[PDB]
Amino acid sequence: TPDVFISYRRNSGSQLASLLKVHLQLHGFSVFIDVEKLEAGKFEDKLIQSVMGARNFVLVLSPGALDKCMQDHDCKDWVHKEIVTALSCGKNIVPIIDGFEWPEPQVLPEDMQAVLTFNGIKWSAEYQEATIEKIIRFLQ
């Protein structure tokens, strides 16, 4: 099982998620992201077990990363599923803010509003090494 599971909105956060993976692996962490380490089997089971096994849950809040989570009361969006699974397993949630504007907590489904109560790390394009070191300090 890995140390860091990176959740992200594909279209807007895939690149930064890969960047976080490369840096965290340079600092000795094992990072799971679907684009690389997702292997054979049902992707639902494998995604859920990877979230459940990872000690840390890094959430890449890219611009509009939670737009498809809103009013998703059937819990069908995968970032929504991953956030709910991380919350359920009492995971160490470390949100990464990258030009993200926090919506009202009450507009998001009740089973994930708690993600807004976690201290996040603002992504700095000018001081990426400092952001990575702060993320390391958040990781366990």
Resolution of the entry in angstroms: 3.0
Annotated ligand binding at 36? The verdict is no
Residues with Cβ within 8 Å of residue 80, at least 6 apart in sequence: 68, 69, 72, 109, 112
Contact 96, 20 (CB under 8 A): yes
- Give me the residue label for tokens 């009740």: 110
CA 41 remoteness from chain centre: 22
Q: How was this structure determined?
A: X-ray
Distance CA 83, CA 88 (A): 9
CB atoms within 10 A of CB 15: 12
Annotated ligand binding at 9? The verdict is yes
Annotated ligand binding at 110? The verdict is no
Q: What is the DSSP letter of 106?
A: G
Distance CA 1, CA 14 (A): 22
The residues annotated as belonging to the active site are 82
Distance CA 55, CA 77 (A): 22
